[PDB]
Amino acid sequence: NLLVTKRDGSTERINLDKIHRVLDWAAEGLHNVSISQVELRSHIQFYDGIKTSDIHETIIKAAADLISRDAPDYQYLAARLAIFHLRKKAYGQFEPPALYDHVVKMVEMGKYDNHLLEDYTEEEFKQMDTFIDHDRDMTFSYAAVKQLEGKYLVQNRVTGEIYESAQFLYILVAACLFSNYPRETRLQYVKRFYDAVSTFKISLPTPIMSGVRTPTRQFSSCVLIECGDSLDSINATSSAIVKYVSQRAGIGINAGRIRALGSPIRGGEAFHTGCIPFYKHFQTAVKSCSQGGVRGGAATLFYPMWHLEVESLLVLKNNRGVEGNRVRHMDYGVQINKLMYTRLLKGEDITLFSPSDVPGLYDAFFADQEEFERLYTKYEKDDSIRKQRVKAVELFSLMMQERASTGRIYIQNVDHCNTHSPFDPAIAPVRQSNLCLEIALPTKPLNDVNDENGEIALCTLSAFNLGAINNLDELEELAILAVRALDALLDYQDYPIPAAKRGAMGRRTLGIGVINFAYYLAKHGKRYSDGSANNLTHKTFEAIQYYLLKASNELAKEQGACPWFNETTYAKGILPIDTYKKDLDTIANEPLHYDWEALRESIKTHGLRNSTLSALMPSETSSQISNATNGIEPPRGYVSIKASKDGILRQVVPDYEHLHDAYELLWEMPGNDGYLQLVGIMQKFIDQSISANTNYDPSRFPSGKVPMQQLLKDLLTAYKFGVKTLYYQNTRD
Amino acid sequence: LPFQTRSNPIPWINTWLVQIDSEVDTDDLSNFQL
Ligand SMILES: Nc1ncnc2c1ncn2[C@H]1C[C@H](O)[C@@H](COP(=O)(O)OP(=O)(O)OP(=O)(O)O)O1
Ligand SMILES: Nc1ncnc2c1ncn2[C@H]1C[C@H](O)[C@@H](COP(=O)(O)OP(=O)(O)OP(=O)(O)O)O1
Ligand SMILES: Nc1ncnc2c1ncn2[C@H]1C[C@H](O)[C@@H](COP(=O)(O)OP(=O)(O)O)O1
Ligand SMILES: [Mg+2]
Numbered sequence: 001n002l003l004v005t006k007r008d009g010s011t012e013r014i015n016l017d018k019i020h021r022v023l024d025w026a027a028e029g030l031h032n033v034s035i036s037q038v039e040l041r042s043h044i045q046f047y048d049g050i051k052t053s054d055i056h057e058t059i060i061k062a063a064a065d066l067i068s069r070d071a072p073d074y075q076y077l078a079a080r081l082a083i084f085h086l087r088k089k090a091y092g093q094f095e096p097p098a099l100y101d102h103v104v105k106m107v108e109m110g111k112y113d114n115h116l117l118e119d120y121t122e123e124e125f126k127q128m129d130t131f132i133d134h135d136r137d138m139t140f141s142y143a144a145v146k147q148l149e150g151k152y153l154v155q156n157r158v159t160g161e162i163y164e165s166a167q168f169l170y171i172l173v174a175a176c177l178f179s180n181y182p183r184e185t186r187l188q189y190v191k192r193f194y195d196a197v198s199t200f201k202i203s204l205p206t207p208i209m210s211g212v213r214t215p216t217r218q219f220s221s222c223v224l225i226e227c228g229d230s231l232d233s234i235n236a237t238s239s240a241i242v243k244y245v246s247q248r249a250g251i252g253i254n255a256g257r258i259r260a261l262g263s264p265i266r267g268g269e270a271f272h273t274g275c276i277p278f279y280k281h282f283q284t285a286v287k288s289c290s291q292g293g294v295r296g297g298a299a300t301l302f303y304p305m306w307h308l309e310v311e312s313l314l315v316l317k318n319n320r321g322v323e324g325n326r327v328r329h330m331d332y333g334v335q336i337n338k339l340m341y342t343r344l345l346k347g348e349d350i351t352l353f354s355p356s357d358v359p360g361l362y363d364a365f366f367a368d369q370e371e372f373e374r375l376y377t378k379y380e381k382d383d384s385i386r387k388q389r390v391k392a393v394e395l396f397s398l399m400m401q402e403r404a405s406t407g408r409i410y411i412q413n414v415d416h417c418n419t420h421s422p423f424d425p426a427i428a429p430v431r432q433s434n435l436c437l438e439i440a441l442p443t444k445p446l447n448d449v450n451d452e453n454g455e456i457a458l459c460t461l462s463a464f465n466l467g468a469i470n471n472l473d474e475l476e477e478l479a480i481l482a483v484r485a486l487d488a489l490l491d492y493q494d495y496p497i498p499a500a501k502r503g504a505m506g507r508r509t510l511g512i513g514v515i516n517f518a519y520y521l522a523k524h525g526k527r528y529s530d531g532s533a534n535n536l537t538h539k540t541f542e543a544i545q546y547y548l549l550k551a552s553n554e555l556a557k558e559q560g561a562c563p564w565f566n567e568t569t570y571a572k573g574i575l576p577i578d579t580y581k582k583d584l585d586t587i588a589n590e591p592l593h594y595d596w597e598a599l600r601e602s603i604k605t606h607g608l609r610n611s612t613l614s615a616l617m618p619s620e621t622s623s624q625i626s627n628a629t630n631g632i633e634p635p636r637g638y639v640s641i642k643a644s645k646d647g648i649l650r651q652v653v654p655d656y657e658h659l660h661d662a663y664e665l666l667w668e669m670p671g672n673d674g675y676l677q678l679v680g681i682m683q684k685f686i687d688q689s690i691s692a693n694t695n696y697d698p699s700r701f702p703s704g705k706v707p708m709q710q711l712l713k714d715l716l717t718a719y720k721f722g723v724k725t726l727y728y729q730n731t732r733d
Numbered sequence: 734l735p736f737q738t739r740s741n742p743i744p745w746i747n748t749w750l751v752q753i754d755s756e757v758d759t760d761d762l763s764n765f766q767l
Pocket of ligand 1: 004006007008012013014015016018019022052053055056059085088
């Protein structure tokens with residue numbers, strides 16, 4: 001008696017079968033899954049004239065909630081339903097249209113860049129359509145398909161209509177990246193890279209999964225900016241923010257050079273108003289495109305611990321404090337060096353100086369360790385310099401305090417960054433971290449929005465799916481097939497800021513990390529707490545780094561080494577296996593499988609196409625696609641729940657039907673001594689800083705309170721293994 | 734068993750069939766070498 005509205009817009013009487021047939025399909029080859037469940041769960045409410053599209057969308061969200069530990073398969077069921085639904089809005093039918101017709105039509109619509117037709121010919125598109133395997137859309141998971149549907153797929157924001165499939169994404173993104181390649185190997189890479197991203201072998205950032213083949217050439221995930229102690233530099237840094245924030249890219253401010261409050265200006269014509277006043281200006285700049293004033297644009301501000309206004313900066317994210325002196329919309333990262341921790345252990349005081357009062361003391365902080373201990377102790381006895389004595393035990397407590405309450409206050413060991421980094425602490429020292437704290441690239445203050453001398457550290461992210469390769473030797477292909485794609489991107493994309501282009505084309509740095517690490521250890525039957533993976537972690541990453549350098553090495557001969565390279569340690573015949581924390585030889589003995597002395601001579605001649613090739617970053621959005629564990633972070637639960645944007649999606653861990661025992665859920669670990677112990681081993685082969693985060697469960701401590709004794713313990717433990725930085729500090733709620 | 738082994742086809746039928754510690758010690762951490 002009731003009627004329904006079909007997609008085309010035709011109307012026919014309601015028929016249950018139509019739903020039964022569909023659900024029965026996606027349920028094919030699945031177990032512990034029942035068709036009736038979805039239908040009733042859906043509580044679908046028929047009503048005269050109901051659009052068939054709505055009915056489909058309701059059943060999908062139904063089988064979506066089914067996903068559970070008892071019946072995981074459901075998350076392939078919903079996924080299959082989602083893709084079927086997507087194929088309707090994209091092509092009006094399940095069977096996808098010719099790769100060539102699809103690009104042509106889109107170009108006329110203004111979806112894909114018109115260069116695709118000027119770089120490739122019709123005869124070639126038909127040749128690439130063969131590599132495509134639309135049957136790979138079923139290898140996805142509800143958690144993955146849901147992401148592509150919301151963001152990754154090229155779809156109208158206003159209407160919400162889809163325009164392409166998951167496969168057309170990979171085939172195109174790889175092709176654009178290799179567009180400027182020789183006709184002899186141009187199509188070649190397009191295939192291998194395609195069967196590398198579609199097969200879940202390599203994970204690519206959100207700005208990349210979406211953009212390439214979009215007219216927009218903006219693929220920068222985040223930008224690091226170093227602000228100088230000037231009004232001109234501040235405005236330049238502020239304007240630089242408003243530029244990238246509108247591009248939805250993370251920001252990494254260092255105001256740590258701004259003189260403290262009370263500091264005299266131009267001899268004494270005026271006194272500094274303080275840091276807080278300026279810090280706020282930066283926030284609004286990051287929120288300038290945020291909706292409401294609340295959410296979006298993420299920016300981490302850094303500064304030295306020995307700073308004079310440190311005590312006033314650590315409590316910025318704290319409520320108490322009228323806004324006059326507060327900033328709860330920005331993250332922070334207290335920079336610490338060896339000397340600092342020393343004063344803590346001995347329970348000795350820390351002198352709080354100012355950047356202007358102590359000349360060279362600031363630069364010593366990163367570029368040189370010994371000079372710092374000489375100047376610091378020097379300015380301490382000097383009474384002609386404003387300072388302040390504070391117990392190292394108290395300062396470190398106030399930091400961990402705000403770090404435990406907010407869980408945003410990050411830590412950055414500048415000594416390790418300049419101790420074991422590709423960059424020469426004398427020419428291009430690391431004095432910054434990106435929002436996530438994974439990047440460690442040099443930066444320079446800008447005198448204006450278009451300053452030439454300025455250098456805005458930029459980077460290209462990527463990662464290897466450890467749960468996709470059989471052996472470590474398989475990284476040999478992925479490495480070269482990855483470094484090239486990213487390297488070419490640096491030239492494919494544009495730069496809205498001179499300083500940005502300067503550093504981008506200068507050292508051409510890249511950030512390639514790893515994903516699905518949890519599953520990796522699961523297969524080999526390893527854990528974190530016990531640390532029975534220290535050797536494995538050493539061997540695995542040893543290759544990950546070897547092949548990356550070996551890849552950027554061969555690339556250098558073909559296109560030359562980066563222009564600024566002489567700056568890098570690699571030029572002076574220096575490898576990470578030399579400047580690594582010697583204290584790592586107490587938690588691992590895994591020898592070098594790969595003959596680096598060989599790469600040493602190779603790089604010492606041609607160099608590297610890129611300055612930095614290895615970065616470990618936290619990747620939930622990217623990993624969700626490969627249905628893998630976010631970055632190296634262990635699964636919070638067998639069936640972690642991620643809510644985005646509109647609704648939470650249940651994502652079951654990989655190979656749960658056979659790995660249930662193996663996995664060591666985050667909450668479940670005794671402490672962090674085991675986790676951080678692995679990060680230090682990884683850093684031994686990372687040119688860039690791992691965004692490792694701590695974890696604390698008040699249920700494992702007496703009085704249901706986390707003791708400050710343990711907080712400082714892990715902090716020192718990490719520093720002992722060369723841990724560069726510390727990300728979040730998840731507190732079990 | 735006359736019929737082939739199978740997972741239950743209607744699991745729904747079973748629904749009707751039943752703070753921060755401030756503690757600091759210098760000596761305990763002084764033994765930790767950086
Ligand atoms: N006449 C109907 N009565 C009830 N449900 C229907 C009817 N027709 C289709 N459905 C269901 C089946 C699917 O689960 C969902 C979506 O149908 P969908 O295939 O996407 O669009 P469509 O109706 O234009 O194609 P098709 O003719 O192949 O069903 O709606
Ligand atoms: N009138 C002001 N009120 C508040 N803060 C100021 C004022 N002028 C400058 N500042 C701050 C901004 C910067 O943090 C810092 C220095 O600014 P800057 O422009 O470099 O000073 P200046 O170039 O005129 O002389 P100098 O830097 O040598 O002291 O002091
Ligand atoms: N508000 C935001 N919008 C888009 N990207 C953001 C963001 N905040 C941070 N990021 C980025 C910056 C980081 O370099 C990056 C690190 O993790 P990622 O795996 O690269 O992200 P993703 O999972 O989206 O691919 O996420
Ligand atoms: Mg000045």
